[PDB]
C-alpha cells in the first residue's frame, strides 16, 4: 500500500466570500498491491477538514497503479464568512490522507482570506463609514446602496425577488460593496435583489435578534405588542427592520408590475429577518404580515 502524490502543499490565495477555488492534484498507487485511501479527522475532530474546504473525491480504491485526481475545493459560505471576516479562523489546515492499513500523507493548506461586508454584523457595519476593503450610520451603507438601486430601477421590475440573479454579477456586487461606495451597483435588478437577500441571510445576527425571536412569535397576533418587541432591538437592528418594511410596502404599491405580493414577501423575508438560533412558521409570517399591511 503506497501512494505517490503530485504535490502536498496547496495555496488558496485571496479567498473571497462565495467564490469557489479548486486546487487539484493527482494520486497514484505506486505500490504493488491495491490500496484504499480516505481523508480522516485529525486526532479528536469530527471532520477531516474545516467547513470551507472539501476534498473531491475524499475516498477511493486504486489498483496498482491507476491514478486519480483529487480536487481540494475552497468555498466560503454563510457558515464560515463571519469567523473568517473576524480572523477567528484563517485559510489554513492540514488534510490527513489515510491509506487503509498504511501510511498517512499530510497535505498542508495555506492562503489568505479577504473580509467581506457580507457576514459582518449590522452594528460593526454602521460603525464603518468606508468600504471594508477600500455617530454611527442609521443603517449600513451597503444595505442602503442595494435598496437605493432597487428603489431607483426595480420598482416596475417583472418578477422581482422571484427570479434568481447571475452568479457572476452577485460576486461583482459583493466585491463592489467590499471595496467602494459606487455611483451605480453593477448587474441586473434580479442580481441586486438576490444580493440583498444574501446579505440579510449572511448576517451574523439577524435583523431581528435571536433572543427576541421567541417573543415575536408569542406576540404575533397583537400589533401593539409586535411593535413593542421591535422597540427592544438595538438601534441599528430596529432601523434596518423599519427601513426594510417601508421598502417592501413601497414595492407592494407596484405589484401589478413587479408581481410582489404579500404572500411572496411573507414567505420570502420572514425566514431571513426572523431566524431561530412548524406552526411557528405561521406565527412568524403573521408577525411580518402585521407590519406589511
Amino acid at each position: 500500500p503506497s501512494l505517490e502524490l503530485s504535490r502536498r502543499e496547496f495555496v488558496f490565495e485571496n479567498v473571497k466570500f462565495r467564490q469557489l477555488q479548486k486546487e487539484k492534484f493527482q494520486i497514484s498507487n505506486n505500490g504493488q498491491v491495491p490500496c484504499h485511501f480516505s481523508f480522516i479527522p485529525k486526532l479528536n475532530d469530527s471532520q477531516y477538514c474545516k467547513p470551507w474546504l472539501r476534498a473531491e473525491p475524499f475516498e477511493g480504491y486504486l489498483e496498482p497503479n491507476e491514478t486519480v485526481d483529487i480536487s481540494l475545493d475552497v468555498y466560503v459560505s454563510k457558515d464560515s464568512v463571519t469567523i473568517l471576516n473576524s480572523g477567528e479562523d484563517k485559510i489554513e489546515d492540514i488534510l490527513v490522507l489515510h491509506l487503509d492499513r498504511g501510511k498517512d500523507y499530510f497535505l498542508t493548506i495555506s492562503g489568505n482570506y479577504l473580509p467581506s461586508c457580507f457576514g459582518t454584523s449590522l452594528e460593526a457595519l454602521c460603525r464603518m463609514k468606508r468600504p471594508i476593503r477600500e455617530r454611527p450610520l442609521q443603517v449600513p451603507k451597503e444595505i442602503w446602496l442595494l435598496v437605493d438601486h432597487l428603489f431607483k430601477y426595480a420598482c416596475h421590475q417583472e418578477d422581482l425577488f422571484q427570479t434568481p440573479g447571475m452568479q457572476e454579477e452577485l460576486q461583482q456586487i459583493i466585491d463592489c460593496l467590499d471595496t467602494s461606495i459606487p455611483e451605480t451597483i453593477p448587474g441586473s435588478n434580479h442580481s441586486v435583489a438576490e444580493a440583498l437577500l444574501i446579505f440579510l441571510e449572511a448576517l451574523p445576527e439577524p435583523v431581528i435578534c435571536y433572543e427576541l425571536y421567541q417573543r415575536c412569535l408569542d406576540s404575533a397576533y397583537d400589533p401593539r405588542i409586535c411593535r413593542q418587541v421591535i422597540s427592544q432591538l438595538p438601534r441599528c437592528h430596529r432601523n434596518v427592520f423599519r427601513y426594510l418594511m417601508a421598502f417592501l410596502r413601497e414595492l407592494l404599491k407596484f405589484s401589478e408590475y413587479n408581481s410582489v405580493n404579500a404572500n411572496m414577501i411573507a414567505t420570502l423575508f420572514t425566514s431571513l429577518l426572523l431566524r431561530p438560533p412548524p406552526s411557528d412558521r405561521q406565527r412568524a409570517i403573521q408577525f411580518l404580515l402585521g407590519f406589511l399591511l
Binding site: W144, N239, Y243
Partner: peptide
C-alpha cells in the same frame, strides 16, 4: 413616504 426615510438614511453616504 419611503423616499423620505431612505433619503435620511442615506445621510453620510
Amino acid at each position: 413616504p419611503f423616499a423620505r426615510l431612505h433619503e435620511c438614511y442615506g445621510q453620510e453616504i
